[PDB]
Write a protein that binds this ligand. Structure first.
Ligand SMILES: [Ca+2]
Length: 201
């Protein structure tokens, strides 16, 4: 930790790699500031939720923030340490999606039982949908303009029956190969929005 706490930034860089938006020295600085506000270096789910409530005033981010917080162990109780908190912000707001597919699986596997069910896709798709301001949902395709439609389209693209289980192997294959699945599972609010106002006539 430099010798006086701080080498937690190495673990972060390792687990995030090129995806990092920070050097270890900057992470330590953010960490020093983090500790002035959260002395224990831990952050609860309620506190994490507040971050998103504050920075997404146009949306209803509570469910979304809770699922993101849980992705780091499928637990609503407890806390996230600085490392998981930095990685969580990166997953929702920075970098490329294709480097986040393994984490995306953990996000979609709500109960953490190793596979994704149809209902879990709907729960997450709904949470992400609520991150879109009412103003933008009108630019959304007819067959992708409600949580139900989006979630069923994703399930259909995976060629699944109502009670089938979706594995990580297939989730990664499909999110990489089929760009429509990518578009529909997309969890970064800005990316959903920016594609939600582009394309072609
Ligand atoms: Ca599951």
């Amino acid at each position: 930790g430099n010798s006086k706490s701080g080498a937690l930034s190495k673990e972060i860089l390792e687990e995030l790699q090129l995806n990092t938006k920070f050097t270890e020295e900057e992470l330590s600085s953010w960490y020093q500031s983090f500790l002035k506000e959260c002395p224990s270096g831990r952050i609860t789910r309620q506190e994490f939720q507040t971050i998103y409530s504050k920075f997404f005033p146009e949306a209803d981010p509570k469910a979304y923030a809770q699922h993101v917080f849980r992705s780091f162990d499928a637990n609503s109780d407890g806390t996230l340490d600085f490392k998981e908190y930095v990685i969580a912000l990166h997953m929702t707001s920075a970098g490329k999606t294709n480097q986040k597919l393994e984490w995306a699986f953990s996000l979609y596997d709500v109960d953490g039982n190793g596979t994704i069910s149809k209902n879990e896709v709907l729960e997450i798709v709904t949470a992400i949908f609520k991150m879109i301001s009412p103003e933008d949902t009108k630019h959304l395709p007819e067959d992708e303009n409600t949580p139900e439609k989006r979630a069923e389209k994703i399930w259909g693209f995976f060629g699944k029956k109502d009670d089938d289980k979706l594995t990580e192997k297939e989730f990664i294959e499909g999110t990489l190969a089929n760009k429509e699945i990518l578009r529909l599972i997309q969890f970064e609010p800005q990316k959903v929005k920016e594609k939600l106002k582009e394309k072609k006539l």
